[PDB]
Amino acid sequence: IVEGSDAEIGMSPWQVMLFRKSPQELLCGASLISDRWVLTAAHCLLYPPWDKNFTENDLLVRIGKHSRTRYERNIEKISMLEKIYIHPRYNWRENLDRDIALMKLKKPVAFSDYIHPVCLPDRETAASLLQAGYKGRVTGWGNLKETGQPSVLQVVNLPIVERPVCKDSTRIRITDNMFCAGYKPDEGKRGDACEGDSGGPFVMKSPFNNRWYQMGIVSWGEGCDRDGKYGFYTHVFRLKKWIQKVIDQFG
């Protein structure tokens, strides 16, 4: 996260760290959506241009974390993966269209002050909140700058951007399964996700029922926090039918 701040304790209890076993390192962010299911970006698990293709046993899920590097004894919980599910029409060849994957845990994780699932949006909540100017919140342990790494979880609030502005900021083909967020050059304020934040949640707090909803997944961007560029996010509601299909069949 570039130009964000330290998270408060328990601020984002759905935040998940995807952790590579060997070598031990941060792979991606992710989110807890039930006691057995974790949501992330497909490109965190599968991206052939970078020779990335992780299998279940390559990875661990670390939940309830604040510190990036510490083993947070008695606070974090570490889970093994039973199965990875990548969207069947995830487009890794071109533009990361449908950049979404589910991971089922081998065992349910115990909820605590630091560990709690986020809501997934219904159509109405999506329609109400996914509007240009409305702000969401992105969290992660990724890079503090495009070109180091934070001591603890970082947070930044960013406005959703008009789709034509998103489209005009890039040569990459944008789809309805994406949205973009971030400040314009003229708006003064700054902030963006960056590498390492991939797969983490873009969340919004519904003013109707005061619950947090995950509207987006950190997906891609050209550099980090560049003037005139925006962060792009997987549109979670647009792919919720797939999410529900996987959980209904395998959960």
Binding site: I9, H116, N210
Partner: peptide, 28 residues
């Protein structure tokens, strides 16, 4: 889950975090 999106250390105890008001103010 019926309890999703409600944080034990914030919503569950009616405490607000330091910047969630920024989000609310953006929701017209």
């Amino acid at each position: 889950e019926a309890d999703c999106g409600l944080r034990p250390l914030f919503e569950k105890k009616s405490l607000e975090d330091k910047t969630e008001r920024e989000l609310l103010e953006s929701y017209i």
